[PDB]
Amino acid sequence: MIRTMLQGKLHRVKVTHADLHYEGTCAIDQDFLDAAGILENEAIDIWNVTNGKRFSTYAIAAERGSRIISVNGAAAHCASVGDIVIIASFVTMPDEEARTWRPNVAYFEGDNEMK
Amino acid sequence: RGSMIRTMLQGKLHRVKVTHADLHYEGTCAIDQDFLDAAGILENEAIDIWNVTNGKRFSTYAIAAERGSRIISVNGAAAHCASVGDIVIIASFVTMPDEEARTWRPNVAYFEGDNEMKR
Amino acid sequence: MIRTMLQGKLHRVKVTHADLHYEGTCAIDQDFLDAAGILENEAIDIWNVTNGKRFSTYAIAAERGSRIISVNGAAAHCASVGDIVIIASFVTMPDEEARTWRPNVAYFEGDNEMK
Amino acid sequence: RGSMIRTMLQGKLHRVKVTHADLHYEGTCAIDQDFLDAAGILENEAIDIWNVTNGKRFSTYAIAAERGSRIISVNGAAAHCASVGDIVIIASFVTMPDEEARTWRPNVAYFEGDNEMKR
Numbered sequence: 001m002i003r004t005m006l007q008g009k010l011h012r013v014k015v016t017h018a019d020l021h022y023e024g025t026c027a028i029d030q031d032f033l034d035a036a037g038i039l040e041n042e043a044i045d046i047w048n049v050t051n052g053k054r055f056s057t058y059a060i061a062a063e064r065g066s067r068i069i070s071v072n073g074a075a076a077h078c079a080s081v082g083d084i085v086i087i088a089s090f091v092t093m094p095d096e097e098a099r100t101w102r103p104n105v106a107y108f109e110g111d112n113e114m115k
Numbered sequence: 116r117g118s119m120i121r122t123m124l125q126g127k128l129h130r131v132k133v134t135h136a137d138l139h140y141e142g143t144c145a146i147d148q149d150f151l152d153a154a155g156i157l158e159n160e161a162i163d164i165w166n167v168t169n170g171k172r173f174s175t176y177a178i179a180a181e182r183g184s185r186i187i188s189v190n191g192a193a194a195h196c197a198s199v200g201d202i203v204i205i206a207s208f209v210t211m212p213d214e215e216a217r218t219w220r221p222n223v224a225y226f227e228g229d230n231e232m233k234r
Numbered sequence: 235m236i237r238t239m240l241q242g243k244l245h246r247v248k249v250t251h252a253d254l255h256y257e258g259t260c261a262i263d264q265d266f267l268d269a270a271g272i273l274e275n276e277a278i279d280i281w282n283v284t285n286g287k288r289f290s291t292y293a294i295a296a297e298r299g300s301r302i303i304s305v306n307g308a309a310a311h312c313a314s315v316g317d318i319v320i321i322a323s324f325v326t327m328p329d330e331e332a333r334t335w336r337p338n339v340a341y342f343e344g345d346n347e348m349k
Numbered sequence: 350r351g352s353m354i355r356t357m358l359q360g361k362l363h364r365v366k367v368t369h370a371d372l373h374y375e376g377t378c379a380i381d382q383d384f385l386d387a388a389g390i391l392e393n394e395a396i397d398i399w400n401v402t403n404g405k406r407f408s409t410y411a412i413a414a415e416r417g418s419r420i421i422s423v424n425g426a427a428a429h430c431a432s433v434g435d436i437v438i439i440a441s442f443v444t445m446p447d448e449e450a451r452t453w454r455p456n457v458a459y460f461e462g463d464n465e466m467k468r
């Protein structure tokens with residue numbers, strides 16, 4: 001059987017931009033994507049610690065070192081600048097592999113400073 | 116064998132406008148076949164609809180509307196989630212192994228006006 | 235690439251029972267499951283035409299011919315007796331097969347009379 | 350090859366009670382490893398939580414809490430969706446080909462009282 005497993009997680013990043021009108025696509029500092037194993041164009045779940053909203057989208061890379069978490073398009077209805085969110089992706093694999101799988105978790109403090 | 120499988124954006128229709136929404140007398144969401152083609156979306160494929168106007172997010176499937184009709188019809192229970200005039204994003208996601216995912220290019224079609232696909 | 239496709243749909247069935255406390259598991263007349271290709275223990279989506287709620291659960295079989303649609307446990311917060319719902323399941327398959335895939339759709343009127 | 354793949358209930362914890370819920374200082378949901386074993390749920394597996402008390406439904410993942418702790422800890426953003434004392438159902442779903450799905454038996458564990466697993 002095939003299991004759905006946490007691939008990686010950005011833990012407690014702060015939303016830095018949220019534009020309904022002008023922008024549409026969610027964007028995340030490429031360094032953060034790299035640490036969590038999350039890919040450009042991959043499905044992600046965003047869990048908003050500030051307001052409790054939970055939604056699914058995909059992200060593209062923001063510039064390395066920018067520390068950007070940009071939640072745009074329709075998703076701007078779900079997060080505001082300054083909200084603390086958790087961003088996760090999930091992968092599937094057979095049960096035998098899933099039993100030893102290790103996700104990639106990156107922790108943040110302050111203004112999206114990775115620990 | 117046993118490769119880790121990613122869920123990736125296959126394609127999307129960016130900022131199409133809902134043209135029809137009927138709760139009672141229709142059920143199935145329908146999208147102009149030309150639009151489905153541009154986004155690589157199939158008839159009967161699962162789609163996510165993200166409503167830019169009201170923020171609602173939901174999952175359904177679509178059938179093809181007549182080519183050239185420019186229809187985006189959100190019917191059945193989903194008519195509680197969108198209305199005629201609303202701007203929505205319609206996406207489909209596929210699964211593939213990690214290596215393919217890392218160079219995958221989604222099929223994105225951009226819209227304006229009367230559901231005119233931009234060049 | 236692997237596509238997620240509609241497997242089958244029960245179109246406009248009426249909820250006949252909704253018990254939060256006593257029962258937990260959603261149940262559907264086995265004849266209806268058979269017509270839609272939906273399996274016992276399969277993930278299903280329920281889209282409530284009456285109140286707009288959309289949720290995911292799984293169902294077990296109710297007695298053949300009972301015409302039961304029972305929405306119980308936590309899901310009783312999402313539907314009431316008399317609500318009209320659409321129940322769907324989805325399967326995955328490769329793109330090449332998905333292009334010709336045909337879902338199983340069953341239509342209903344009145345008191346869960348299949349057409 | 351090309352078999353149609355079903356999403357099936359793998360297992361569930363039926364009517365466990367939330368024992369801890371911390372928004373700010375913790376993130377990860379945790380479940381007594383004995384409970385994970387009984388339901389066939391893995392550490393880091395996607396789970397659905399259906400809150401019997403308040404009707405909220407959400408998806409997350411769990412890590413193992415100490416065996417015998419009887420912990421059901423719903424933390425991070427998910428602490429907006431459950432509270433200590435709430436009765437919840439925790440399910441995981443797996444995928445498999447249609448033939449296997451048709452005879453698949455989910456791993457269901459039933460609870461009462463102080464998160465006591467019924468025989």
Ligand code: NA
Pocket residue numbers: 132
């Ligand atoms: Na407009």
Ligand code: NA
Pocket residue numbers: 366
């Ligand atoms: Na109790």
